[PDB]
């Protein structure tokens, strides 16, 4: 079949654009993730630590 | 002229920051009357050494002693 990726418009009304220029402008996005989806550092470490611990293996 | 004035605004939203602050320093300080006690404020600091003048007759005010009534009021800035 298909899918058609990268095709939309923006919308072009007072509504939106100023969503698109309260981004821009005051980086609305660019925190989003990097500000947050970065830290979120607070998940255990996973390291298999070494000279004693070992890892799996099969027969 | 303001479909302008949105679509330079969802394009480059930077500049016009600089512009929103360019003018709007340059227009109140003709406005609000805060000013102009900036004026007077910033004579009556004495850096220098007042000098007595001479009194003979007049002497319009300001007798020796400060503190008798003398000349104006800087006091509206104390309680100010
Ligand atoms: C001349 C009017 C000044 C007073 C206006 C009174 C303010 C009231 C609100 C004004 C609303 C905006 C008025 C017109 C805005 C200009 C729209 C435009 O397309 O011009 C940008 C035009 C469009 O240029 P462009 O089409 O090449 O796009 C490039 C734009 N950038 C830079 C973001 C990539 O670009 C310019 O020539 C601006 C260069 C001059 C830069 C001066 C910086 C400001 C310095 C302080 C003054
Ligand atoms: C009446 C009073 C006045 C009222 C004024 C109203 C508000 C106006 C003040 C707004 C000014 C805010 C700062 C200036 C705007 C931000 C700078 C800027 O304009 O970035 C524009 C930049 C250009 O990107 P673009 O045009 O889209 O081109 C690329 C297309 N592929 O697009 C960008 O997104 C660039 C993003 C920045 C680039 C570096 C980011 C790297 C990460 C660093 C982020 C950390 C900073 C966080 C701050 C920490 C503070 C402690």
């Known amino acids: 079949t298909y899918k058609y990726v990268n095709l939309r418009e923006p919308s072009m009304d007072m509504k939106s654009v100023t969503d698109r220029a309260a981004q821009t402008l005051l980086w609305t996005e660019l925190i989003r993730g990097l500000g947050m989806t970065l830290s979120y550092l607070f998940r255990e470490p996973a390291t298999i630590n070494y000279p004693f611990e070992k890892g799996p293996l099969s027969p | ?62 007798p020796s002693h400060p503190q008798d009534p003398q000349g104006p009021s800087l006091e509206w800035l104390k309680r100010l």
């Open chain 2, 1 to 62: 002229v303001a479909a302008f004035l949105k679509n330079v605004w969802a394009k480059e939203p930077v500049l016009v920051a600089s512009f929103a602050i360019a003018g709007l320093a340059v227009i109140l300080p003709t406005l609000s009357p805060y000013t102009k006690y900036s004026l007077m404020i910033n004579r009556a600091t004495p850096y220098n050494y007042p000098v007595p003048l001479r009194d003979d007759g007049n002497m319009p005010d300001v």
